[PDB]
Each structure stands twice: as structure tokens, then as C-alpha cells.
Amino acid sequence: ILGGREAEAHARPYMASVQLNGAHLCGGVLVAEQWVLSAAHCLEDAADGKVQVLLGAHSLSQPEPSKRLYDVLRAVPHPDSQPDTIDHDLLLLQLSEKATLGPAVRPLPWQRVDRDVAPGTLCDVAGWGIVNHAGRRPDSLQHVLLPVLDRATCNRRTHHDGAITERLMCAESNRRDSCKGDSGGPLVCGGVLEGVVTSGSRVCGNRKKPGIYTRVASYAAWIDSVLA
Amino acid sequence: ILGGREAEAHARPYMASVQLNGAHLCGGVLVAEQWVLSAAHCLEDAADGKVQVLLGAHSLSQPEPSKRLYDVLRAVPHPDSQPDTIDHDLLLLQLSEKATLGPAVRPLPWQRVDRDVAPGTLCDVAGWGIVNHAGRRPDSLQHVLLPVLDRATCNRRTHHDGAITERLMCAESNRRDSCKGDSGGPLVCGGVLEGVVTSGSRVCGNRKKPGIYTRVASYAAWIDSVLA
Numbered sequence: 001i002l003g004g005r006e007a008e009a010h011a012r013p014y015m016a017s018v019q020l021n022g023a024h025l026c027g028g029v030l031v032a033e034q035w036v037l038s039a040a041h042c043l044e045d046a047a048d049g050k051v052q053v054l055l056g057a058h059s060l061s062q063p064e065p066s067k068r069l070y071d072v073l074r075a076v077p078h079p080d081s082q083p084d085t086i087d088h089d090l091l092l093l094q095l096s097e098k099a100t101l102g103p104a105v106r107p108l109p110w111q112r113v114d115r116d117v118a119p120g121t122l123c124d125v126a127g128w129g130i131v132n133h134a135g136r137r138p139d140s141l142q143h144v145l146l147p148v149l150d151r152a153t154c155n156r157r158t159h160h161d162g163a164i165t166e167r168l169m170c171a172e173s174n175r176r177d178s179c180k181g182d183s184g185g186p187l188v189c190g191g192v193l194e195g196v197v198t199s200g201s202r203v204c205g206n207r208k209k210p211g212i213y214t215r216v217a218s219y220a221a222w223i224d225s226v227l228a
Numbered sequence: 229i230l231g232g233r234e235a236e237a238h239a240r241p242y243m244a245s246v247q248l249n250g251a252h253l254c255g256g257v258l259v260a261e262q263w264v265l266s267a268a269h270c271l272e273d274a275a276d277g278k279v280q281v282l283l284g285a286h287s288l289s290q291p292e293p294s295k296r297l298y299d300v301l302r303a304v305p306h307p308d309s310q311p312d313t314i315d316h317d318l319l320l321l322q323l324s325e326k327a328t329l330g331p332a333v334r335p336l337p338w339q340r341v342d343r344d345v346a347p348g349t350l351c352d353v354a355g356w357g358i359v360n361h362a363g364r365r366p367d368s369l370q371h372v373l374l375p376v377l378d379r380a381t382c383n384r385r386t387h388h389d390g391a392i393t394e395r396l397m398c399a400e401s402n403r404r405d406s407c408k409g410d411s412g413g414p415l416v417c418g419g420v421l422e423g424v425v426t427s428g429s430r431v432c433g434n435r436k437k438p439g440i441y442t443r444v445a446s447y448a449a450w451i452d453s454v455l456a
């Protein structure tokens with residue numbers, strides 16, 4: 001997260017850390033007792049590497065009572081995601097066993113009404129990804145409150161040039177934004193999961209290129225089918 | 229709402245006011261584009277009286293652009309409820325038309341994971357019900373942060389004499405409590421809808437009588453079947 005502050009210890013019990021071979025890879029959101037939502041592009045270059053989910057964490061390194069590592073039984077990427085595209089960039093991960101819920105670990109329901117978030121609305125994004133341009137990776141969870149931009153504005157030529165489809169939404173990126181390592185994480189508006197940080201190569205914090213987020217209500221039916 | 233404070237203008241887009249002949253009767257929660265969730269007992273003796281739902285409000289009297297009154301097309305009470313019990317006190321109201329959404333109007337999803345909120349957790353309850361024992365009704369929305377009580381303690385003989393089941397929960401009521409007119413309102417924990425204020429004739433702000441809330445997760449199947 002660029003331009004944000006450190007988040008309160010475990011004020012977001014739904015936050016997860018998708019790891020590849022023991023290192024933080026992407027954020028994720030516990031959406032059910034044994035499922036985590038993340039970004040499909042996060043697993044692109046996984047290979048033989050092992051993928052695990054960390055729960056109840058604030059510090060990626062220091063031992064915490066609430067922390068627990070879980071292996072993954074199955075990684076279900078959305079059928080229509082592609083390595084060369086930012087559409088349908090969703091991924092579901094089934095934990096090896098139900099999570100042990102507590103004050104520091106609990107699922108967050110996602111929006112099911114397929115209506116856009118109103119521009120101007122401040123949404124919270126949290127993550128362990130890039131903190132600055134030097135590439136500094138933080139040890140603790142950070143977060144920022146960003147305003148939602150109108151798609152008409154976001155699709156302007158000199159902006160995303162009409163690439164933001166109806167399944168996508170934009171938020172500002174002027175000196176505040178989500179960067180590498182924040183992909184797969186949640187965009188919580190008013191306490192509700194409205195989006196997921198979309199994976200793709202982008203400079204962090206350029207006002208001319210607003211952040212792109214996958215609208216989770218646009219995929220409510222798919223999420224439901226996988227979790228059956 | 230005894231012992232709380234005025235809520236931030238329209239920071240709870242899902243908050244609804246259920247009215248009988250143009251007067252605030254109970255609270256509600258916008259739960260889908262055309263449905264509001266409330267308490268069954270609220271409409272105990274309403275019958276053919278004119279019922280309506282007020283969305284986008286903060287002040288019950290002053291004009292605000294976001295305010296809009298809707299007529300109720302269908303009132304669906306939980307089929308297992310009976311006038312003499314606080315059990316299955318849920319009611320779904322179908323609005324006359326899909327609610328027009330915007331910054332101050334938006335649905336809130338309910339927790340689907342049927343698990344207890346840990347005791348000691350602080351949850352938020354909002355409403356336009358009585359603010360003191362003199363029965364003074366406020367003009368604008370109020371709210372309070374309340375600690376969740378464990379069911380065993382709430383079930384104590386001095387409290388709710390074995391009345392609290394697995395579909396119910398409690399919160400402390402020592403001079404901070406929901407009250408008359410607050411029924412049907414939301415019990416939100418960490419931004420998640422976790423309960424609906426139970427309607428019943430009960431004393432306000434008394435430590436020996438904890439506030440009782442209906443757990444929505446244990447009714448998710450009923451809700452889903454009605455909204456489809």
C-alpha cells in the first residue's frame with residue numbers, strides 16, 4: 001500500500017496472506033470457513049512451489065498467538081482468466097481444513113447486489129505489498145481509504161482508455177494506492193467486501209492510472225458454485 | 229438507543245425506518261434491492277394500516293436529497309413465530325419497487341457462517357427509538373457500541389431464564405441498550421450484519437436484563453428462499 005498507515009493489529013480478522021514457498025505473495029480474503037478469495041494472476045508463476053494461506057496475522061515474521069498456517073487442497077482460478085488479460089482475475093483457495101475462528105480470524109460476507117459502488121465512496125484497501133517506490137516491503141499490515149471514481153472518468157482516453165468493463169471499478173491512485181503484493185486483497189466499502197485488488201503490471205500511485213478492482217458482486221454466482 | 233450518540237449522517241446506507249401511518253415504528257435493514265429485513269412483532273397490530281419504509285434518512289423530519297418513502301407490497305413473517313414468543317422474530321418486507329441506490333442507499337449482506345460472535349466483542353446497534361426513560365424520541369439516528377454477552381451467562385436465572393437459544397444472542401445492557409422503537413434494527417460486528425434487534429416488551433438499560441438479538445446466520449436458508 002502506497003501512502004497509507006499501519007492498520008490496527010487484528011481489526012480485520014478476514015485478512016489473509018497467500019504465500020508461495022514461505023514468502024508473502026498476495027493478499028486474500030477469508031470468505032468462508034475453508035475458502036479464501038484472491039487474484040488468479042497471483043498463482044501464474046507458482047509451478048512446483050507450495051502455496052499456503054496465513055491467517056490471524058498482523059506481522060508476517062513475529063510469532064503471534066492467533067497466527068496459523070494452512071496448506072491448500074485446491075486452487076480454483078476463474079475459468080476465463082488469462083495470463084495476458086486483467087479480466088476475470090479471481091481465484092478461490094480451499095484450506096486443508098476449516099479455519100479455527102476467533103476474534104482474530106473470521107469470514108467477511110461479500111456484496112451480492114450487482115450495482116456499482118457510488119463514486120466518491122471511500123473504500124478501505126489493506127495489504128502487505130510495496131510501501132514505497134524504493135520497493136520496501138513492510139512486516140505489518142498497512143491500509144488506505146480511497147475514493148471510488150466514476151467509470152466514465154476512469155475510461156477516459158488518457159486514462160484507462162475504456163478498458164474498465166462492467167465487472168471492474170476504479171479508485172484513485174494519486175499518491176495513495178495499492179501496489180505489488182497487495183493483489184488479491186479486499187476493497188471494503190462501508191464494512192462490505194465490494195472488490196478485490198486486480199493483478200497486473202502498473203506503476204504505483206500514478207494519478208493518471210487509477211487502481212482497478214474486480215467487483216465481487218459481478219461474480220456472486222460463480223463464487224457460490226465453487227463453494228458447493 | 230439508551231446511552232449512545234448521534235450517528236455520522238448517512239454512514240449506514242442500509243439503515244431503514246419502518247413506518248405505520250407516517251410515524252417511525254421500528255428499524256430495518258435494506259438487504260437486497262427490493263427487500264427490507266425487520267422484526268415480526270413490529271407489525272403485530274398493523275394489519276391493513278398503511279406501512280411504508282423510509283430509506284436514505286438521518287433526520288426523521290428534515291428534507292435530505294437521499295430520502296425516499298416506499299410502500300410495502302408484501303410482509304412475510306417467519307412462519308414459526310407466534311405472538312407469545314421472542315422466537316423467530318424475523319419479517320421480510322418487499323418494497324413497491326426496486327429501491328433507487330446511491331451514496332446513502334445500499335444493501336448490506338448478512339453473515340452466512342453460522343458461528344457465535346466471541347463474548348466481549350463490541351458490536352454496533354443503530355436506531356430512532358427512545359433515548360431515555362422519559363420516552364424522548366430523537367430526530368436523527370443514534371447508535372451505541374455494546375459488548376456481546378455469552379449465552380450461558382445470559383441464560384442465568386437472574387437474566388433470561390433459559391430463554392436464549394442458539395438462534396439468539398445477547399449484549400450487555402448496563403445503561404447502554406437498544407430500546408422501544410429500535411426493534412428490527414441491525415447488530416453489526418466489525419462491519420458485518422450479525423443480528424436483528426428482537427422486539428418484545430422489555431426493560432431498557434437494566435443490567436439484569438441483557439439486550440436480545442436474533443442471529444441472522446441461523447436463518448439464512450429461510451431468507452434466501454424468500455428472496456428468490
Ligand SMILES: *P(=O)(OC(C)C)OC(C)C
Pocket residue numbers: 025026041042129178179180181182183184198199200201202
Ligand atoms: P499485484 O500484487 O499488484 C499489481 C496491481 C501491480 O500483482 C502482482 C503479483 C503482479
Ligand SMILES: *P(=O)(OC(C)C)OC(C)C
Pocket residue numbers: 253254269270357406407408409410411412425426427428429430
Ligand atoms: P422493539 O422496539 O422493543 C424492544 C427492543 C424493547 O418493539 C416494539 C415496537 C414493541
